[PDB]
Design an enzyme around this catalytic site. Structure first.
Site, PDB file in Angstrom:
ATOM      1  N   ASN A   1       6.771  -1.533  -3.497  1.00 56.83           N
ATOM      2  CA  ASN A   1       5.911  -0.372  -3.805  1.00 56.83           C
ATOM      3  C   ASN A   1       6.307   0.905  -3.083  1.00 56.83           C
ATOM      4  O   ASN A   1       5.584   1.907  -3.140  1.00 56.83           O
ATOM      5  CB  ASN A   1       4.419  -0.686  -3.527  1.00 56.83           C
ATOM      6  CG  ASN A   1       3.954  -1.911  -4.255  1.00 56.83           C
ATOM      7  OD1 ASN A   1       3.661  -2.921  -3.635  1.00 56.83           O
ATOM      8  ND2 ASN A   1       3.899  -1.840  -5.598  1.00 56.83           N
TER       9      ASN A   1
ATOM     10  N   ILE B   1       4.961   6.106  -1.954  1.00 56.92           N
ATOM     11  CA  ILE B   1       4.196   4.864  -1.957  1.00 56.92           C
ATOM     12  C   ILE B   1       3.405   4.750  -3.252  1.00 56.92           C
ATOM     13  O   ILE B   1       2.620   5.671  -3.579  1.00 56.92           O
ATOM     14  CB  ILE B   1       3.178   4.852  -0.781  1.00 56.92           C
ATOM     15  CG1 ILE B   1       3.906   5.076   0.552  1.00 56.92           C
ATOM     16  CG2 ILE B   1       2.438   3.537  -0.736  1.00 56.92           C
ATOM     17  CD1 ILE B   1       2.930   5.394   1.721  1.00 56.92           C
ATOM     18  N   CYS B   2       3.572   3.623  -3.958  1.00 56.29           N
ATOM     19  CA  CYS B   2       2.740   3.322  -5.125  1.00 56.29           C
ATOM     20  C   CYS B   2       1.443   2.637  -4.694  1.00 56.29           C
ATOM     21  O   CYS B   2       1.375   1.412  -4.507  1.00 56.29           O
ATOM     22  CB  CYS B   2       3.483   2.479  -6.149  1.00 56.29           C
ATOM     23  SG  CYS B   2       2.568   2.506  -7.685  1.00 56.29           S
ATOM     24  N   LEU B   3       0.429   3.462  -4.464  1.00 60.57           N
ATOM     25  CA  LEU B   3      -0.872   3.000  -4.082  1.00 60.57           C
ATOM     26  C   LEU B   3      -1.868   3.783  -4.921  1.00 60.57           C
ATOM     27  O   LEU B   3      -1.797   5.013  -4.964  1.00 60.57           O
ATOM     28  CB  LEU B   3      -1.073   3.271  -2.576  1.00 60.57           C
ATOM     29  CG  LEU B   3      -2.317   2.700  -1.917  1.00 60.57           C
ATOM     30  CD1 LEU B   3      -2.408   1.170  -2.090  1.00 60.57           C
ATOM     31  CD2 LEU B   3      -2.260   3.111  -0.459  1.00 60.57           C
TER      32      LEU B   3
ATOM     33  N   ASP C   1       2.749  -3.263  -9.949  1.00 66.64           N
ATOM     34  CA  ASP C   1       2.994  -1.820 -10.029  1.00 66.64           C
ATOM     35  C   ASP C   1       4.090  -1.359  -9.062  1.00 66.64           C
ATOM     36  O   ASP C   1       3.824  -0.633  -8.093  1.00 66.64           O
ATOM     37  CB  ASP C   1       1.710  -1.017  -9.835  1.00 66.64           C
ATOM     38  CG  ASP C   1       1.783   0.388 -10.464  1.00 66.64           C
ATOM     39  OD1 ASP C   1       2.827   0.775 -11.078  1.00 66.64           O
ATOM     40  OD2 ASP C   1       0.781   1.117 -10.344  1.00 66.64           O
TER      41      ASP C   1
END
Lengths: 161, 161
Positions: free
Chosen positions: B91, B98-100, B131
């Site tokens: 992520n 950052i994929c959050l 994701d």
């Protein structure tokens, strides 16, 4: 160790805001002849200004609107000042950008928005064909002043009244 | 009359600055386990953070640096949070992005930088292959977990110690 690494401005905001509030008080108390300015709304960085065409100039009778935008880097960088109202003038282009020394390379933080507006009025009275933004207008001013001034008066009536 | 016309944010600056100062006090008094954050310098909009790899995770023993940048639109727009330290994680990409969910479409102004850091720690413990930002890492996590974790530990020792 560069290998270990991958590949808005508090202080300036405070200083710019302090200066702008002072300038607003000054220009409200003691505006330049024929000109007014102040915030458009809640944002202290975005002002409007009205300039009346200087008496005796080819812009006489015109009412011109200007946008004045301060950046957080004010007063260390100049305000951005543009004519909103169309004007036929060798130092002022179709985007309303003004060729005035103090708005670019000759800016000093000691200058005020009152001084800038005074200077713009002086430029409407006495244009500067040595530093034009509209080449065709500057050459016409030099070579066919009668046509230049006829056109400037016509554009004043058409767009500024 | 459109023909007559030619062809930074006070209010948001005030609100964002108020919020950021409160969050600084909060995160100093009550930091998330394994994480610290605060301004890098005079600019309240630009913070640094240190996160220790969560115990028991493949990042254990790592010391990771993050850049946190607030915009004048904070808290209505999320802070920009990136890893400065290289990390092998499906992520988190090579730019440290950052994929959050809460850093993008799921941001709410009620969230705090303490909650964001807690969430990032949770992501280091339990990545989200549904994701990913690094496709190859996510597929490796799914299909060859042993190699994934070996590589994550290796990158922790190499870049985060």
């Amino acid at each position: 160790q560069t290998e270990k690494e991958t590949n808005k401005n508090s202080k300036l905001l405070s200083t710019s805001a302090k200066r702008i509030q002072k300038e607003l008080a000054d220009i409200t108390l003691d505006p330049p002849p024929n000109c007014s300015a102040g915030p458009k709304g809640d944002n202290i960085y975005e002002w409007r200004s009205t300039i009346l065409g200087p008496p005796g100039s080819v812009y006489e009778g015109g009412v011109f609107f200007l946008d004045i935008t301060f950046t957080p880097e004010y007063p260390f960088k100049p305000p951005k000042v543009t004519f909103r109202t169309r004007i036929y003038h060798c130092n002022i282009n179709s985007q309303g950008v003004i060729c005035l020394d103090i708005l670019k390379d000759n800016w000093s933080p000691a200058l005020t928005i009152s001084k800038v507006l005074l200077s713009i009025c002086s430029l409407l009275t006495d244009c500067n064909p040595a530093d034009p933004l509209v080449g065709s207008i500057a050459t016409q001013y030099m070579t066919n002043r009668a046509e230049h001034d006829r056109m400037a008066r016509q554009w004043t009536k058409r767009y500024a009244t």
